[PDB]
Subunit: 124 residues, 4 copies
């Protein structure tokens, strides 16, 4: 079977794009995230990301996580998922995310986290 590789340019269901560079032997990678929409009335852009792929047992379809450090807001998003070979033999990232808003008071902390999915496929 193919190995599923994180390295490449990706697009998701919402029209956002993402690039991920080479993964080092420690499983670390950097990338960029170019977002389609926004929960702010601020314009979007490219924002950097950093994360790791799990290399335990050197699975062909590894789990990974990354953090997006939004450059156009005070928020942070983390993504986590797995690099699968799909039924049709394509690479697919199946991910879920938490979007953390900045709040001014610790008493608003409870409503500062949104959750959802994103499915990435390779954009050539």
């Amino acid at each position: 079977a193919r190995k599923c590789s994180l390295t490449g340019k990706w697009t998701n269901d919402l029209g956002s794009n993402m690039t991920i560079g080479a993964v080092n032997s420690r499983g670390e990678f950097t990338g960029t995230y170019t977002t389609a929409v926004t929960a702010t009335s601020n314009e979007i852009k490219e924002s950097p990301l950093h994360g790791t792929q799990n290399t335990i047992n050197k699975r062909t379809q590894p789990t990974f996580g990354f953090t997006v450090n939004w450059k156009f807001s005070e928020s942070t998003t983390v993504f986590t998922g797995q690099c699968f070979i799909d039924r049709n033999g394509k690479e697919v990232l199946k991910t879920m995310w938490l979007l953390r808003s900045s709040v001014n008071d610790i008493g608003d902390d409870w409503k500062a986290t949104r959750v959802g999915i994103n499915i990435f496929t390779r954009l050539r």
Copy 2:
């Protein structure tokens, strides 16, 4: 200014130490859980520097060294005069078959204070 650097412990008794935060907001650390005895896994993340908030949001990934899983944590560094990290996490399990993907993600909270 609530800062991520230092030694932390959470509501479950796990420990975490985080190094210096660089100008791009990036930091690395080690996450410590007990089952055997104690396990140590690297973590890497960033804090948000937009508006240079005294109470910044942040994120990090734990690359578990004892399983195939990955966890990401995100939240906000609060300063009352004690510092507290309020976080939520997603724990992604490895599945073999994409048909099992639906059940591979767990979610929860952790609250960290200085150890």
Copy 3:
């Protein structure tokens, strides 16, 4: 007006039928998954009636009859001209010891269309 009453199927191939929605917005139904063959569990929930929106939010609980677990789903009934339910769910597993509570909750999405 996007309506919850009827027969639905999701992206995983599970089926769901929901009865009439009463004046308090309450409804009951049956949720159908395949493993054996097919299982049937009751569900109960409400749709939100504030402002009598054409595309209302809603929630429901599935009381699984084949395990000790419970799932809740919440989301919004959209009308494009096809009706689509966009939902997220939490699947709560039973643990024996409160010390295991942290890992008892999974999260995901389901999208339902008319069957």
Copy 4:
């Protein structure tokens, strides 16, 4: 050991209160939710809830779920968790929730779900 029972008045970490009535033999219950804060600039109140407790194997510490049908907004929250006897012998509900906002466009669906926890203890 005690059985953990849903029936009663409860308070959580945020200061919200909740009542749950008798649970019927089908595991069904009704209740009310009186909330401390809000993600809206609307005032709070009492809102009804309905849900079920799992009775498979008649566990002493059952899982359950319920839906809160907010009367002061277009949103809906679902809660799910387990009724534990804690280390100190008290009943505790350990729950997690999804708060679904109403959006006007299906294209905003992605940011319409927030997530968090709530810990309930009996208020006498």
